[PDB]
Amino acid sequence: MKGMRSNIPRALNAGAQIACVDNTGAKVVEIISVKKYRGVKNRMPCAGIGDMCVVSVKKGTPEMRKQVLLAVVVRQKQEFRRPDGLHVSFEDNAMVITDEEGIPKGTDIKGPVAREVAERFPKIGTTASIIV
Amino acid sequence: MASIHRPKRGSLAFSPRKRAKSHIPRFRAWPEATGEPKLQSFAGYKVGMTHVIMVDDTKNSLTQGMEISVPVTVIETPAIRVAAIRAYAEDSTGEKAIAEVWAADLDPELKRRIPIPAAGNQAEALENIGKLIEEGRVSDVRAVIYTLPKSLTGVPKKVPDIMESGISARDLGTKFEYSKTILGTLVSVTDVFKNGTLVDTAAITIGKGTQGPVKRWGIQLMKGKHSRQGSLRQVGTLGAFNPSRVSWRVPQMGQMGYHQRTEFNKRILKIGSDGEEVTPEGGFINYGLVRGDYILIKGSVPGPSKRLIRLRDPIRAKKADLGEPNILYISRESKQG
Amino acid sequence: MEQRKCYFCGKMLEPGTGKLYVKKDGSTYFMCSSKCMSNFALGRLPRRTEWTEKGKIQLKKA
RNA sequence: GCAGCUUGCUACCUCGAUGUCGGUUCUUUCCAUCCUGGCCGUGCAGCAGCGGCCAAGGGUGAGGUUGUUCGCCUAUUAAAGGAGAUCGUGAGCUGGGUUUAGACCGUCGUGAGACAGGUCGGUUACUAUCUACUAGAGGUGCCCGAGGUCUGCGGGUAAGCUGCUUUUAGUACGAGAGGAACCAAGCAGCGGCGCCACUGGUGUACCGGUUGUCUGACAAGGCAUCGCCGGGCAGCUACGCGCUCAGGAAUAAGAGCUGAAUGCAUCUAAGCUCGAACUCUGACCUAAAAAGAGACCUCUUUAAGGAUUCCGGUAAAAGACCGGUUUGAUAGAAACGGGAUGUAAGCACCAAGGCAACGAGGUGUUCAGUCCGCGUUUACUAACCAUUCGUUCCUUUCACUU
RNA sequence: CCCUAACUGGAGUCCGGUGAAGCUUACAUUCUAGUGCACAGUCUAGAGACCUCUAGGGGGAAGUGAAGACCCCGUGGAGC
RNA sequence: AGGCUAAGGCGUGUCGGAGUAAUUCAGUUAAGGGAAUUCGGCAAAUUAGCUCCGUAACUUCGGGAUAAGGAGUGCCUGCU
Ligand SMILES: [Mg+2]
Ligand SMILES: [Mg+2]
Ligand SMILES: [Mg+2]
């Protein structure tokens, strides 16, 4: 997609369970694969901030559970750097449930969200209240 | 067998990976001239790295205009003396040295490298090279330069490093007359490179000794149960049954580092004249403080501190004129904290 | 070039250095070095550490 | 008909053993091409297909079952091709299956026992002689003697390959829906090379807290994985960071121009112009041990200069390499700068209390104390004293010196 | 494991002392193809190759260990 | 038990110097992810003493049971 302004390490890889922080009803979602990521041999599919991911709901409502959805990771403990040289990090990982193009399924996002995903997916920026 | 495909480990583009045959990098090719006469190369010594907060000026970049922190590399680049003027005769076999003329006046420190040439055939060698250029035997003129590291306190040496730097002009008579003007003089790095222009940095990289295949080629460590069976940092197989020989393309241990490498499009960010503008508190680590005139190069450069760095104008520079940078802050805080 | 102050030691964040640590509730802390971030992560308080300027402030209160 | 990549047929080689499947690691090869590049046809409007030709430079992944090969299934993806290399690869690994000795189930057999049936368990030996490769040196060969700077016979490369988004453009096309390409820009995936300002790891230098115990108590220390725990400079390193283009020539399929054989027409029979991720040049690494064994300049012949002794680190497995040597800041000390930890011991007061003695601990002296495999100033000490080669070695086979 | 990194002690590397063993008809600096009992460093035709030493891990020597324990044969055995 | 010390026995679990690679035997630590590795959580990691609260299916009524899930713990002053 559109290039962000900050370098983001691909912290999360396939099999990680990330606290889904929207009101979609899915609580914990496991990363199955990552859109727009061709791998190399033996390398697990990694996903840093602003990446769309294919996830399966592990914990949540009875209707969201076991589905395969599209999610965007909005926070990560693995620190990234801003263009001015400062490194930014978060207390926990988190992803929101979205569509192919970037529109979230939920209506409010609890907690902060990195500003890079706000500038890439502007609907994710507007839906979330506090942006970091 | 359902083959799983992996790219080859390491590059065969840089083989045989042996120890480079000189501490001075050598340029195999030089860019064609596009303007007024000037030396195409300068030599400096790498001091260390810092970072600047420069306003972004790169056209079409995402972060244009806004503040960025660019890792720079301060390089201590005093004046150089254009020692000799050497002309080459081109033929079917190749370029061959046809004649040289050394400068009459030269630094006394040069004796540690080569015995000092006498101030003899200065006018007559020049007229001989002029006649050779006139008749047509001469094709290109190059200048011999050496550093004068006796001033630098961070570099322990005082012997010059001698190297050839081609002149950049249009006509071989024009090149000869410019070389006559600059022969035997001290030309600062401001007379070669301009502020904001790309260059090519070549230098013998950091020697890492006899390193193993996992570090030399980035091969895979043995995984899982194979990690503790007796071969962990060893290549899994050296060849098939046939052909009955180890290929040269198999990863193996050997000399890692201390190779010559060329880096393209290393931008110049600052042309300074006082070492206190960039020298941090406590000096640089294992170097000292800057005492001559320097240049700030964006990004990394091959080689450790104190290594000779050869600078030439770019040979494959994609981008146009870039303009003067706008440094807001050269970070001269301590590198030891 | 916004001027940033370290949450723990009180040192001013120099340009091109430091970290920005964010909690789950949107609170942001500027850490000048790994030492300040590690002391924050242990649960220590700047007021109860004498080398920080907050600890010096509290000790010079009395 | 081809291939010999499945199963057969055969019995030519091997039974004084060519370690037998599958996976893993790493390298290479073929094209009958899955994707990437170039074309042709269409029942090709566009988008997207379908079929064919050229093309092997690069890519061809991650997972669930199963020992599997194969095959299915999942979500990505440009695509997630196939095959060869003793069904590549056990003096590399694994040991899941098959193919030992034990045992159970079923079926055969009167029985011992058997099953191209299933199940559980079941030893991976070796100090590398030669060769090959990978790097590092010592010689001679070439050669006025030495040094320096270059050239380039050659060798190598993928040094890049490929997607996503924006613009072109909601335009061409189309009745509508739907919907491209040329140029340009940014970012990303993988690969390559390099680096340590920033971030992260380590950091058994160092600093602090503290358990148990020993040295009589305090102080200072020993041991218990660095006792454990917290922090971390330098260094190294990635999880961090820098760079990573073409252009040109000749071409394959193909598309044409001129043009006859065949008065015309014809891309072909001569000739000519374009035409690809291929080839070549261009970059980049290496390259006088190129037997055509190189070119030029400088210095000087008992010298030029090299090596060793000495102080070192930009280097280092040994060698080698790169510097300094009193006309010197090469390494060390002293001091200071810059940093690591967190406020030392002793003393004064306070301390929940205790009649008292005592008292964990708090505050002041004290941003203290301790420490720095970093820098600067500084010859204070140590880089001094030598030494050997550049003489065949004796000879008066002499260019001599008793 | 993605994906490896740094550090510690013992080896290894280098040095002083001591000090064996296993493979071995000979030669041997190889590489390609063919031929040959159809799996060649020694044949045939080409291509490369100056020699010596050190370190490296194991491509090849159908590497060494060993009169195959699988299959067959023996007017050979043993146990049941 | 394990750790630290007496007495007692020893520096002979009879090769030393040196601190310069790769690799190897045995250890320490490792961001973010947490079995995605693999035939298989093999190996390693986690937890761990004592007191108190509390403890399920099922059961041959004996058990399961230390089930599981939790809290406290040092030092000093003074006492019962
Ligand atoms: Mg083998
Ligand atoms: Mg036999
Ligand atoms: Mg018979």
Ligand SMILES: [Zn+2]
């Ligand atoms: Zn701070």
